[PDB]
Amino acid sequence: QQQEATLAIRPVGQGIGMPDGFSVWHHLDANGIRFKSITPQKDGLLIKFDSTAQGAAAKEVLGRALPHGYIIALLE
Amino acid sequence: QQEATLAIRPVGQGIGMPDGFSVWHHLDANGIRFKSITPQKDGLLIKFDSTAQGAAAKEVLGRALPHGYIIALLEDD
């Protein structure tokens, strides 16, 4: 089977608030992107995908949708 | 603290699933901290670090979704 992928969203620094998982959820479903799970963290958000393809599609969507000051990284 | 899972499913074939972001909205609006949300084909699983948080979320989601949904608290082994 396919290898799952993780999208990590963190603020670039202090002054920028934690990414809102409600907004992230909205932007992913608005673009028809399906994720496996969302895990809120102290200063960040982890989103799991069933594939790296979905993760990458979510990265280009959240890159444009999320306001300035967020680090969006795709992981294995 | 043994982890807890909240399972939300429609009572039957026909009833859809509410937009998953609405559940997120209702939990944060009531200051409920959850560990994770896992969307399923016909459902939703929410993990909690404890059964106390899970129970608080069940009461909150029970009032946000008063009809057509099975909300069940499950305790992890």
Judge whether B48 and B4 are in contact, CB under 8 Å. yes
Residues of A whose CB is below 8 A from B48: none
| Assigned architecture for domain B1-77 | 2-Layer Sandwich (3.30)
Nearest to A36 among B20, B25, B38 (CB): B38
What is A1-76's CATH number?
A: 3.30.70.260
* Way it was determined: X-ray
Question: In chain B, which residue's Cα lies nearest the Cα of A41?
Answer: B35
The ranges assigned to domains in chain B are: 1-77
Distance of CA A68 to the CA centre of its chain: 14
Distance from CA of A40 to the nearest CA of B (A): 7
Beta bridge mates, B75 = B4
Residue A23: how many CB atoms within 10 A of its CB? Answer: 15
Residues of B whose CB is below 8 A from A25: 20-21, 24
3-state secondary structure of B46: strand
Resolution as reported, in Å = 2.5
